[PDB]
Design a protein around this ligand. Structure first.
Ligand SMILES: Cc1cc2c(cc1C)N(C[C@H](O)[C@H](O)[C@H](O)COP(=O)(O)OP(=O)(O)OC[C@H]1O[C@@H](n3cnc4c(N)ncnc43)[C@H](O)[C@@H]1O)c1[nH]c(=O)[nH]c(=O)c1N2
Ligand code: NA
Length: 489
């Protein structure tokens, strides 16, 4: 009867039963992790692909009426696949927002409305079409969905200049657990605060986000400078941890470290001419010179930073043919105090070259991201943060998991004394189920279980998130294994 309920309001075109011949390709289209696409993963009973907001409301009403929970999917990047799989057998539908990819840019007001189903590449491209001197601070990977990226916070190469995506959202269109359509005004301050950074799923289905668009110069400068240990990587990184978080807001230098080399990748909101003396003055250890400069427009920096590409702009931002589906494991940490130089020695000399070693990505904070009060948004990793670490393990055959998974665990153990503690902070969008998962009692996720992983992602904000959840979704309709549990008065 679920199908009959849906088809009353939604075209058959947009309803994919699990038995449907079209269902496997719709399911797989935006799966980004080969661990979660294989037949042993728990599959949704139905996938619904709305093209307008009433289809979302209808699906929710139908879901409530027929006791079918919904997991919403935008770009499909969830590290645990929680947008399209459950961990244990469960009946659920996926509401897959991929056909709702509209981006309307008001270049004059410097605001834009973007559907959650858009990918970052489509958002970024539409901004560029409106103006060569406007930008929006979200993720690095162009295939990330707006929905998940904004709901969990969202950060990238502009985080030092403008903070996270979520703190630059000025309104939303959202469907709640009752199928009611909300904006900022009708949902109220608590719900609007929660939705912008408090994690995907928990607070309802965001249909579209209104954002403020921010200035960038017509030319930005990117560099990618690699250092092995004999070229000085240990001393350069030992300096970087102090220097990079204190650099002017216009300069962000992230690190990608894999095997024998650390690649220092910078985006500077300016020219080589001003970048050169700044580097020689503030970060001379890197040996940056004008030859390392790549001047281009902001929009051009997106494929450049992520892929190294210089002339497939539309392909890199706009292509929706997946084709990158590693088996992948991810973890993250936040660092508040400088590592001893000997820890960098262990990381670069032993950890990164062990069997199963992954990639370590280091993003420096400070400036704007750290200026924002910790409780101002649900994202708490702000004042005092030196840098974020992401531990990324890829493998490419189903039987090759043992070594990377073991390295991932062992390194997280090794790093424990040097990273944040009590709670050990982690970024919500770097979803890591090993941080803890919910217990469900009487069909409702418990506060006590949610608190364990919840304080890691959201620290002191977890409480306001759970109280908000209690008000907007007391029966815990919109949930997953690591979603905000209701705390009800
Ligand atoms: C290649 C690549 C690169 C990166 C990243 C991922 C990947 C795959 N990440 C992490 C990314 O931000 C995280 O996986 C997001 O939650 C993904 O959002 P999607 O919509 O793509 O995923 P997906 O559709 O799987 O959703 C993720 C979670 O949000 C919920 N959700 C999705 N749409 C929603 C909606 N409309 N309303 C409410 N909830 C919704 C889902 O139910 C799920 O729980 C990231 N992050 C980052 O900040 N900066 C970065 O540079 C990167 N880099
Ligand atoms: Na994982």
């Amino acid at each position: 009867d679920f199908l009959g309920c849906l088809v009353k309001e939604i075209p058959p075109r947009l309803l994919y039963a699990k038995s449907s011949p079209a269902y496997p390709s719709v399911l797989g289209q935006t799966i980004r992790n080969s661990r979660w696409s294989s037949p042993d993963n728990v599959k949704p009973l139905y996938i619904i692909t709305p093209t307008q907001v009433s289809h979302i409301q209808s699906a929710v009403v139908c879901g409530r009426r027929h006791s079918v929970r919904i997991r919403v999917r935008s770009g499909g990047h969830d590290y645990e696949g929680l947008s399209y799989r459950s961990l244990q057998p469960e009946t659920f539908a996926v509401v897959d927002l991929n056909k709702m990819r509209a981006v309307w840019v008001d270049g004059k007001a410097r605001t834009a409305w973007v559907d959650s189903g858009a990918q970052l590449g489509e958002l970024y491209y539409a901004i560029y079409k409106a103006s060569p001197t406007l930008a929006f601070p979200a993720g690095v990977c162009p295939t990330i969905g707006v929905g998940g990226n904004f709901a969990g916070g969202g950060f990238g190469m502009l985080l030092r200049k403008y903070g996270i995506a979520a703190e630059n959202v000025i309104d939303v269109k959202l469907v709640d657990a009752n199928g009611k359509l909300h904006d900022k005004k009708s949902m109220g301050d608590d719900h609007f605060w929660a939705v912008r950074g408090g994690g995907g799923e928990s607070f309802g289905i965001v249909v579209a986000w209104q954002v403020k668009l921010l200035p960038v110069p017509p030319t930005v400068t990117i560099f990618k400078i690699s250092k092995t240990v004999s070229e000085g990587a240990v001393d350069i990184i030992n300096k970087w941890q102090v220097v990079a978080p204190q650099l002017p807001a216009d300069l962000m230098i992230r690190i990608i470290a894999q095997g024998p080399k650390a690649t220092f990748e910078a985006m500077y909101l300016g020219t080589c001419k001003t970048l050169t003396p700044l580097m020689s003055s503030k970060f001379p250890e890197l040996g940056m010179n004008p030859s390392h400069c790549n001047e281009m427009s902001w929009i051009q920096s997106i494929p450049f930073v992520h892929l190294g590409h210089r002339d497939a702009l539309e392909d890199d931002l706009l292509n929706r043919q997946n084709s990158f589906k590693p088996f992948a494991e991810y973890k993250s940490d936040y660092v508040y105090q400088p590592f001893p130089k000997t820890v960098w020695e262990q990381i670069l000399n032993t950890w990164l070259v062990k069997p199963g070693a992954g990639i370590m990505i280091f993003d420096p904070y400070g400036a704007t991201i750290s200026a924002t009060p910790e409780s101002a948004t649900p994202f708490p990793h702000r004042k005092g943060v030196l840098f974020n670490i992401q531990y990324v393990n890829y493998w490419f055959a189903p039987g090759a998991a043992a070594a990377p998974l073991s390295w991932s665990k062992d390194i997280y153990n090794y790093m424990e004394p040097y990273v944040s503690k009590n709670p050990r902070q982690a970024y919500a969008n770097y979803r890591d189920i090993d941080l803890g998962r919910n217990e469900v009692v009487n069909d409702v996720s418990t506060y006590a279980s949610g608190k364990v992983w919840g304080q890691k992602y959201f620290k002191g904000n977890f409480e306001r998130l759970a109280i908000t959840k209690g008000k907007v979704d007391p029966t815990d309709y919109f949930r997953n294994e690591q979603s905000i549990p209701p705390l009800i008065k």
